[PDB]
Amino acid sequence: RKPQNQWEGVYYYSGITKRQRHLILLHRKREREAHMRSFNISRASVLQRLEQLSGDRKQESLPPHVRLDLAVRLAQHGLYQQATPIVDELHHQKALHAGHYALLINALACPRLGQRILHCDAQCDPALTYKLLGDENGEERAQEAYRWFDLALTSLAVDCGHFVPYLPQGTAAASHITNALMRTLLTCGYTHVAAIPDSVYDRMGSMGISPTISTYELVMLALSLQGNMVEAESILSFLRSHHSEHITVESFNALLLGHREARQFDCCDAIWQELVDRRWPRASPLTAELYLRSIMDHANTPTSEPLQSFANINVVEKKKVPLVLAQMDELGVPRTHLSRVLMDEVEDSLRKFQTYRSRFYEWGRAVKQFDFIEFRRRNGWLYDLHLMKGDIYYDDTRGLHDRSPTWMNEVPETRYDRLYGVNHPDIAKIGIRRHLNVEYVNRKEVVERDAALMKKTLSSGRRLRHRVESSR
Amino acid sequence: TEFEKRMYDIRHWLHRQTSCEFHTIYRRNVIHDSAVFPTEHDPATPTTHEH
Amino acid sequence: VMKLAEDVCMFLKDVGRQIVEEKLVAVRRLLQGGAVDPELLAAFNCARAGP
């Protein structure tokens, strides 16, 4: 029988229809418009509250906490220019204190515009939120954060008026305000992100402010967004050497995001395996988000060493996705806490590489294989990548033939059958009978039949030779 | 599991007319629950061969 | 089978060295320093009477 191919895979369905992809795109567009509508409604409510407090309260002076909450809600929605005269008035009235300055600088990083940029603009890539929040006035919000940092340090020097030459630089409030400054400067453009471990960290050292774990995590995240991995791994090695009981998961998220940005995915796998090994600090859904996005970025990466001779090579890394998801079921990380775009890619890689036992008993039926062949024959112009177009180390002088008796054990059946007439002058050396040299199953009978036929034709040839040479 | 996945896919590039089977001996924690399976005294009326 | 066992052993050597190096780079980070899991600490203090 014709042989079947054992290196050809079983035909199975791994893909979606054009209608299902169109409905996925339509539903994701609807979710993006819903998030945009929610942010615009909240921003309109905040601006209406500001216009109410500016119009109706023209001469009636408000309490300072209402103005502080209004400035916080204005800065959180990306309206920083409408909040800075409120902060100037509150600082001029000396109503702001140590926590209120850090609250204002943390609100200057706009964590309500960031949610809209996350769900609509960045398509839920958390590094792209930092990359896209620098467009909405990065340098101006950075200058306002530096100005509010100077205001905060002046008010901390006022509020601390022994340890007298070491105040307010030795207090917790200076470190909290510096952490708020770094967290706000991460939101801005690339210049301030690069200046976080360069200028801000050296200024915090020269001022004599003792850092905390959030300081090192924000410096690691700034170096992650820069793409400098040896310095971020050096900072985590410093934290592992000295202050190891204080390390939280944000440093692991910084390294995952940074090795994803530097496109060193083996380091992403190493960091994820280390986080699964130690199990403390606990893996957030941001860990699974960053690791699965690094997997999807590596799997969609085209290679150039085989030059795409047969197919794309990196797609087999999507086979890592049904493993790591199971690890999430051991880590207590809920898989429903993943974004919709990443969930679409994870279900893509799951329907490409996952099967159950009940399907594995039925997936090789000839009906499904021939339906696969018929569906490729009828409409393969819709789904095809090409249709779009002794010991050797102590051996040196080897001892041969050491009187090991091969006659104690039994190997007597070493019979071989050679073809008839190897040195015969009448039998030709070249011939089709050379094809008899490669035949194993019926070897003995074929050699005996060939020898009998050759003996018979040589005997008949010499008989005819004698009869003709004697007849004349 | 990264190695077990890589070990199972040797079956897709094997030689001609050459198959394989896999053996796995791994360590697994077993809990003996002393409340589901308690250690109690023998009953007053014991069991016999007729049971 | 002898030529296959040279093809698979060379395959599992390079794969198995890459996986153990991925585990060795994690173990040497776990030995430099880390924080004790509170669930791991609760597992040691679980018995009523100790030794």
Binding site: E8, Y11, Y13, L385 | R16, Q17 | -
Partner: peptide
């Protein structure tokens, strides 16, 4: 016609058919 047994029994060429053709799931049963 066949492959001889003293020849090296390597794989001749790999086949990427499920990654060239991505088929949606279609059964006759609902």
């Amino acid at each position: 016609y066949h492959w001889h047994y003293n020849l090296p029994q390597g794989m001749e060429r790999p086949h990427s058919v499920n990654r060239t053709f991505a088929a949606p799931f279609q059964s006759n049963h609902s």
